[PDB]
C-alpha cells in the first residue's frame, strides 16, 4: 500500500510490439504480501503455427532465489520447477531481461545472473499475462533489435510526471557503450542517461547554458552488465523520485525541465532493449 501512483494494483500490460528480440520483460516495483506465483506466458508460433515449443513461461515464488523457467509444448504445461525468489516480503521485485534470440536474462537479488534461451523462429512470441496478487509500479513488454549504432526516439516523457515511466537500455555482454538518454528532440545533453556497465554506473549530467550542475550519481545499483535494465523514474505527488533496483536512486530537482525529456541518441554497440510507452 506504498507509493504506487501508476495503477490500481494488480496491473497487467499488453504487448507494445509484435515480438522482435531486443526487449525487456519487466516486473520492477514493489511486491504485495501474496506473491506466491505469477503466469508470465510467452507462447510460440512458427509462422502462425501457434502451439510449437514455447520460449518462455515466467513466475517468481517470493522466498529464496530464482525466477522459474517453463514452457508449453503442444497444449500442456511444461517443466515447472519448485524453487523460490529471494527478496523478503515488503521490498522490490526485479525481472530484467536482456532479450536476444538466444538468451533472456533472469534477474534475482536486483542483479541478473541466469539467461533463459530461445529455441524458436524470430517473430514467434504473442502472449503475456501475470497471475496473483502483486504491487505494480510498472509492467512493460516491447522493443526490438536495434542495429548498432542507431538514431531513434524515446516515446513520451523519460521521467513521467504524475506517473512512473521506466527506462530500458542495454548493458550488453558484447557491446561498447550502453545507454538510452533523457534529453530533448533537438539533440542537446539535458540528462544524458547512461546505464553504462562498461563504466559500471548510472550517470546523469545536466547542461544549462554552459553551466553544469549537481552531477547526480551513486544510488543502490547492484545490477550487472548483461542485463535489460529497468531504471525507474517516478514523479510522485510529493517529490520527483528516481529509483534504481526498486529503491530510490536519486531525486530529480529542477536543472533542466521535467515534462518530456525524452530524447534518444545511440552511439557505440548498444542493442537496445526498450523504447517504451507509459
Amino acid at each position: 500500500m506504498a507509493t504506487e501512483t501508476n495503477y490500481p494494483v494488480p496491473y497487467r500490460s499488453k504487448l507494445t510490439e509484435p515480438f522482435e528480440p531486443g526487449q525487456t520483460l519487466i516486473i520492477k516495483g514493489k511486491t504485495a504480501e501474496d506473491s506466491v506465483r505469477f503466469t508470465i506466458n510467452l507462447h510460440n508460433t512458427s509462422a502462425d503455427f501457434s502451439g510449437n515449443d514455447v520460449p518462455l513461461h515466467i513466475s517468481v515464488r517470493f522466498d529464496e532465489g530464482k525466477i522459474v523457467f517453463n514452457t508449453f509444448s503442444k497444449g500442456e504445461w511444461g517443466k515447472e520447477e519448485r524453487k523460490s525468489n529471494p527478496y523478503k516480503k515488503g521490498d522490490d521485485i526485479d525481472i530484467r531481461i536482456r532479450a536476444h534470440d538466444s538468451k533472456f536474462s533472469i534477474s534475482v537479488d536486483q542483479k541478473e545472473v541466469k539467461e533463459y534461451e530461445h529455441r524458436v523462429p524470430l517473430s514467434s512470441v504473442t502472449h503475456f499475462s501475470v497471475d496473483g496478487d502483486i504491487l505494480i509500479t510498472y509492467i512493460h513488454w516491447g522493443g526490438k533489435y536495434y542495429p548498432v549504432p542507431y538514431e531513434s526516439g524515446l516515446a513520451g516523457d523519460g521521467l513521467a510526471p504524475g506517473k512512473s515511466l521506466l527506462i530500458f537500455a542495454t548493458p550488453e555482454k558484447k557491446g561498447k557503450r550502453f545507454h538510452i538518454n533523457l534529453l530533448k528532440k533537438n539533440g542537446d545533453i539535458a540528462l544524458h542517461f547512461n546505464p553504462r556497465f562498461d563504466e559500471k554506473a548510472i550517470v546523469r549530467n545536466s547542461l544549462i547554458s554552459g553551466e553544469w550542475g549537481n552531477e547526480e550519481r551513486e544510488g543502490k545499483n547492484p545490477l550487472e552488465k548483461g542485463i535489460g535494465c529497468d531504471l525507474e523514474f517516478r514523479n510522485e505527488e510529493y517529490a520527483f523520485q528516481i529509483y534504481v533496483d526498486g529503491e530510490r536512486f536519486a531525486t530529480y530537482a529542477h536543472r533542466l525541465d521535467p515534462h518530456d525529456i525524452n530524447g534518444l541518441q545511440i552511439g557505440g554497440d548498444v542493442e537496445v532493449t526498450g523504447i517504451q510507452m507509459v
Binding site: 512458427s46 509462422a47 524458436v120 523462429p121 524470430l122 517473430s123 514467434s124
Partner: protein, 107 residues
C-alpha cells in the same frame, strides 16, 4: 504454360507459393528441366519465403515478389536465357512438390 515476349518486355512463368516465416525459409526450383529434390539443370536462381532472396534485372520480377511471386517476369532477355525453366512449389510439409516443366522462351 509457354509465353513469349520481346527484348526487355514482360515474360511470365506461372508458379506461386505462400510466404511462410522468418524461420522456415524454403527455396524454389529455378534453372532448366526437372528439379526432383534439387536439380532442374543449369540452376539460375533461388528465392525465399519471408523475403525475395535473389533476383536481378536479367532475372526480374514485376509483381508482388516478396509474398511468393517467383513468376519471373524476365527483363532484357537473350536467347541464352531462353529455354525450358525450373519452377516447382515446395509446400511446407512432406512429399507435396509439384514439378512444372515449362518452357519460357523470349527472343
Amino acid at each position: 504454360v509457354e509465353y513469349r515476349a520481346e527484348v526487355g518486355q514482360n515474360a511470365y512463368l506461372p508458379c506461386f507459393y505462400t510466404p511462410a516465416a522468418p524461420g522456415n525459409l524454403v527455396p524454389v526450383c529455378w534453372g532448366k528441366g526437372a528439379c526432383p529434390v534439387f536439380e532442374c539443370g543449369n540452376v539460375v536462381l533461388r528465392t525465399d519465403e519471408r523475403d525475395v532472396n535473389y533476383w536481378t534485372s536479367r532475372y526480374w520480377l514485376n509483381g508482388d515478389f516478396r509474398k511468393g511471386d517467383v513468376s519471373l517476369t524476365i527483363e532484357n532477355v537473350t536467347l541464352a536465357d531462353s529455354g525450358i525453366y525450373c519452377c516447382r512449389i515446395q509446400i511446407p510439409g512432406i512429399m507435396n512438390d509439384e514439378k512444372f516443366n515449362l518452357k519460357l522462351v523470349i527472343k
